[PDB]
RNA sequence: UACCUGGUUGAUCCUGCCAGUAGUCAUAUGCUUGUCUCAAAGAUUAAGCCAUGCAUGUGCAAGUAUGAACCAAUUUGAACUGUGAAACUGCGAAUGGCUCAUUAAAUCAGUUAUAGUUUGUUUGAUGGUACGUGCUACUCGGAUAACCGUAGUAAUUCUAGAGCUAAUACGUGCAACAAACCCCGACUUCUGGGAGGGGCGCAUUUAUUAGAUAAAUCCGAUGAUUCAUGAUAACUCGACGGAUCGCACGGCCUUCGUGCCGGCGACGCAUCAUUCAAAUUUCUGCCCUAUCAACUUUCGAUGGUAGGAUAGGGGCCUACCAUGGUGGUGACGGGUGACGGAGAAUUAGGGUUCGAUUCCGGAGAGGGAGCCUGAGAAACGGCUAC
RNA sequence: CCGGCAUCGCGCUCCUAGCCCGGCAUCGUUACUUUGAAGAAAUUAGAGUGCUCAAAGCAAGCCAUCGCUCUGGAUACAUUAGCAUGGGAUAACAUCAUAGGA
RNA sequence: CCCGUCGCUCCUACCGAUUGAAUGGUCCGGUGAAGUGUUCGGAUCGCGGCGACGGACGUCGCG
RNA sequence: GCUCUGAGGACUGACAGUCGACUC
């Protein structure tokens, strides 16, 4: 059955901790001034960051 | 039935080796011929791999011997087996098998050394002046019949053929067979 | 199993062959034929995919049977029949002649000819040695095998062969300082000079080969394929010189095609 | 003859023995002249394999086995057979886990032909032919003792 | 995001575990669900059982049609013209598809090998003599489906008999020089001969022989071969060497005689090469267990020889001889809720766990075993037995 | 960073072999490392591309968006075992005192 | 603070006469379907030679 | 039961000559 092999993934992942009030008010500045939907809009965005930040770091690693 | 795989066989260390296939074809074995060697020659036909054949010799008496030293190979009538290094058991049941010792004719041979007006004797004195004839191979005529070893595989390629022993290998068979 | 695999399904076609992972299940299965069904192209990744002279199997099968298309200077109609290397695709309503040449990536692609330059093609040589009754032959990679071969002509060697006398009409000396074109492995499609070949007893002979712009590298002796005597090939290279360039040059090539638009 | 042991006349395929006409330099294996080949592969054969007396259908000099495929070496570990050795590859293997290597061993059955003359412990090379037994598959090309 | 927090105490600092927190392309279920794209879905247990219906058949200009129909329809010679169903012959059904029961150096993976082998086909090349006393080939057979007709049985792609008719089904049989080369050889003249005439396609089997050197007229390959291959003596109750089928008409009389002709195709037969493959194979690589330290060997266990069998190597099997092979670097055995792999989750690095599953390799058809047809099956949408 | 070079560089007859000449074969093994070949695709990273974004996919873009042009469909990794070139510190295995040495 | 014997209730495993039982595999031995191969075998079926006979026969042709 | 095959020795001059009742 190919349709099979068409790739999917996600695109975030939640954060380690669930209950901080540093983390979760800086959250919610982040969400008010961007009107947002909700947390996992936010939370895509520290996904997809964090990909191009691990790529430039194994970069930066290399000469 | 019969098969060639090695997964019966143990393992070198000797540990049971599992079946793991049921048997496939590709690794047949088929009964032996026993050729025997009589007066009703009767080949037969097997459909092998591939779709080709192979002549199963199962009783034969008329063979091809070659005759190597005289460079002469004449078709001839097989007598009896003497000796066979495998299995007296052979010997007793008449088998024509390779590597055996049989025994042949000399007719076919003879005539053909009585073979070899002017231009016939100048070339009769041109040869014997080289005949070599070995007192072994020499005796062998008297008595009218020939230790030849077949070296064919009958009951692969239905035919029996061979070749007239001589030298060391005819005087070690001679000597095992008195 | 129990006897010839007959389909070969998408993900298992080989990776030069470009084709798209989910438009269906299978692959179209080269028939035992000409060439090694690893390195060859049918007929219909020729015609549907890349000439896009159909849309579909069966427009393809119309094609063939048409009796249109002609492979070494002979009409065919099968439809996975393995073309490969300097096999020579003729449509003569189209008056219009391909030879199916490598590029430096791997990929096979459809340089064009005119006339005289489609007349003949060209391939190398398996193995020269006798026959019945002790005739020479050889037998080539394409499949070809010629009778009475010129006697200097040897292993390893390449050939022209015309497609109307069909025999040879030249033949250059597999050796050291002539171009070739490989074929196969990472480094195919590169055209360069030899400039070293080395033995090794009991295992394959490598040539070491010149990009004719300075690069070098080496290859065993199976993928490479002499093309002409000295630096002059013998066969209409295809639109980038068999230089494989990295990939910085190939984004600077772009950045200089846009920037001229 | 001293090598004639069985209950069978043994000699060379292909080679004929009782010829009318013979000369001793002509090629070996014809008008005659014992048979043997060179291996290849940089190897020399034996000199006693050229003007040997014995005669085996696996010696890779003088018999009908063709040295082709890959070329161990090892040292012999047992010589207790007929014509016939043990060798063992002693290596190293890597266990990804540690970093570090761990010493494994293999015992390979060869053949040595009747012109080596291989002691306990003596270093091997060997080469392989096709399947000879159920445990052969080596020929034993070249002793260091 | 390379992270820690609650619990032993009157409190304190620790070892330390319990609990917490997060993820699963990881399953079940609870509660809830308005929209678009995407898509897993009887694998875990029971590779246990199956109603039913389908899943492999097939016709081109090119094998066989007044055996019965349809369309053109005849000047009533000759067509079955053209379209054809049915059936015979050919080919395929050995692919796909599902599942993971078996199986722990075994399958499998990387990488080897075949000089140790079989291969429908596709593609390319190739093809003397069949007897004639080698003096250029010497003749055309019934029986058979479908159809007709007459039956058994309760029966089913269960079955008997009569009557027609075909072949690219079956069975026969015309063969191409010089005969080059080979062996016997009358008489001639003496021969280093002339030779008048008598026996020689290719495949199979066997044996002798060639397949050439080195610095002061030799000539193929491989790392390596008694290789490729040639020649010769024969051998075989020879498979083989065409009694086959389509359109397109078109130069010109030798008796103007479908006249001498000759092309484009199909199908097919054999050898070699190639291709799709396989089969066997070499090194290295697999989890827990020592409350698994000895295992294998009469009956193949390790090897040798001789042989049989196979497509082929091989203890694959037999006869004889030898007593060997493996083992603390874990043999053998035992467990696996173990098919192997590519890979999946988690991952700062190292790792830990998983891998039924759509790609590849293997295995299996309720359990075993044995086979025919065929290039290919130890086949189960084939058979035979339990 | 190296090519190439002298000192107090055991030989070369053979290919590569200079305008008498660099840089040539066979007469200890490996382990290590470097470079290369060859490495099935899908997956993994990664480029390009406005499927609206996205997870994706392997497409697609301008012409006077009038009788076709420009095309792409890269690259990377792949631990081990095996093949090969150069390095020869580090460490094993091996071994010239009977001289059977050169 | 705290230790053990004993008494009562509940859970878990242990030893246990019972030639305990069931399930499943393995080896040896007995019998052994069927297939394959082979030795004989020969129901019928093909030039139906000849008698030069009057579609009929024996001597037949080998397969 | 019958017909065989093989192994196991002595004396005399790794071979040759003669002999040998028994066991497997
Ligand atoms: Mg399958
Ligand atoms: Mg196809
Ligand atoms: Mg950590
Ligand atoms: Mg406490
Ligand atoms: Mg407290
Ligand atoms: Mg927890
Ligand atoms: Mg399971
Ligand atoms: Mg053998
Ligand atoms: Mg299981
Ligand atoms: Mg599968
Ligand atoms: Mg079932
Ligand atoms: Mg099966
Ligand atoms: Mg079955
Ligand atoms: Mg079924």
Redesign the interface.
């Known amino acids: 059955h190919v349709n099979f092999y068409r790739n999917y993934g996600k695109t975030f992942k939640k954060p380690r901790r669930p209950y901080e009030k540093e983390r979760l008010d800086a959250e919610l500045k982040l969400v008010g001034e961007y009107g947002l939907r909700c947390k996992r809009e936010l939370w895509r965005v520290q996904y997809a960051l964090s990909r191009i930040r691990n790529a430039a770091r194994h970069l930066l690693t290399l000469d | 039935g019969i098969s060639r795989d090695?997964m019966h066989?143990r393992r070198?260390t000797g540990g049971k080796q599992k079946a793991w296939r049921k048997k496939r074809k590709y690794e047949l074995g088929r009964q032996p011929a026993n050729t025997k060697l009589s007066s009703n020659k009767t080949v037969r036909r097997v459909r092998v791999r591939g779709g080709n054949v192979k002549w199963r010799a199962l009783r034969l008496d008329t063979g091809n011997f070659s005759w190597?030293?005289?460079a002469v190979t004449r078709k001839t009538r097989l007598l009896d087996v003497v000796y066979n290094?495998?299995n007296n058991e052979l010997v007793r049941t008449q088998t024509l098998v390779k590597?055996a010792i049989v025994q042949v004719d000399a007719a076919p041979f003879k005539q053909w050394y009585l073979t070899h007006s002017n231009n016939v004797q100048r070339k009769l004195e041109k040869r014997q002046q080289?005949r070599?004839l070995?007192s072994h191979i020499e005796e062998q005529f008297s008595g009218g019949r020939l230790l030849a070893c077949i070296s064919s595989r009958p009951g692969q390629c239905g035919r029996a053929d061979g070749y007239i022993l001589?030298?060391?290998?005819l005087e070690?068979?001679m000597r095992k067979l008195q | 199993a129990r006897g010839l695999k007959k389909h070969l399904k998408r993900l298992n076609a080989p990776s030069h062959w470009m084709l798209d992972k989910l438009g269906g299940a299978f692959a179209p299965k080269p028939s035992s034929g000409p060439h090694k069904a690893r390195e060859c192209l049918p007929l219909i990744l020729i015609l549907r995919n890349r000439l896009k002279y159909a849309l579909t199997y069966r427009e393809v099968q119309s094609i063939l049977m048409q009796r249109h298309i002609m492979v070494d200077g002979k009409v065919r109609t099968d439809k996975t029949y393995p073309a490969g290397f300097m096999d020579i695709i003729s449509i003569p309503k189209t008056g219009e002649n391909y030879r199916l040449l490598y590029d430096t990536k791997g990929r096979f692609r459809l340089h064009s000819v005119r006339d005289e330059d489609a007349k003949f093609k060209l391939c190398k040589v398996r193995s020269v040695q006798f026959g019945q009754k002790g005739i020479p032959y050889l037998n080539t990679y394409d499949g070809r095998t010629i009778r009475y071969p010129d006697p200097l002509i040897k292993a390893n060697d390449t050939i022209k062969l015309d497609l109307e006398t069909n025999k040879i009409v030249d033949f250059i000396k597999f050796d050291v300082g002539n171009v070739v074109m490989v074929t196969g492995g990472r480094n195919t499609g590169r055209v360069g000079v030899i400039k070293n070949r080395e033995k090794h007893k009991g295992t394959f002979e490598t040539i070491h080969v010149e990009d004719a712009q300075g690069h070098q590298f080496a290859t065993r002796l199976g993928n490479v394929f002499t093309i002409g005597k000295g630096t002059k090939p013998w066969v209409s290279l295809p639109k980038g010189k068999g230089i494989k360039l990295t990939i910085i040059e190939e984004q600077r090539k772009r950045d200089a095609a846009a920037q001229a638009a | 003859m001293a090598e004639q042991t069985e209950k069978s006349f043994l000699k060379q395929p292909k080679v004929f023995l009782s010829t009318k006409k013979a000369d001793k330099a002509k090629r070996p294996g014809k008008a005659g002249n014992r048979f043997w080949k060179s291996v290849g592969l940089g190897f020399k054969t034996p000199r006693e394999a050229i003007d040997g007396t014995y005669i085996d259908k696996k010696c890779p000099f003088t018999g009908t086995v063709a040295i082709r495929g890959r070329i161990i070496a090892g040292t012999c570990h047992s010589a207790k057979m007929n014509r016939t050795i043990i060798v063992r590859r002693n290596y190293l293997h890597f266990v990804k886990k540690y970093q570090r290597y761990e010493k494994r061993h293999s015992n390979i059955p060869a053949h040595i032909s009747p012109c080596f003359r291989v002691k306990e412990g003596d270093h091997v090379i060997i080469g392989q032919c096709r399947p000879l037994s159920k445990t052969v598959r080596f020929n034993v090309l070249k002793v260091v003792p």
């Open positions: 090695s066989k070198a190597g030293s005289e290094s495998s590597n080289g070599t070995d001589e030298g060391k290998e070690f068979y």
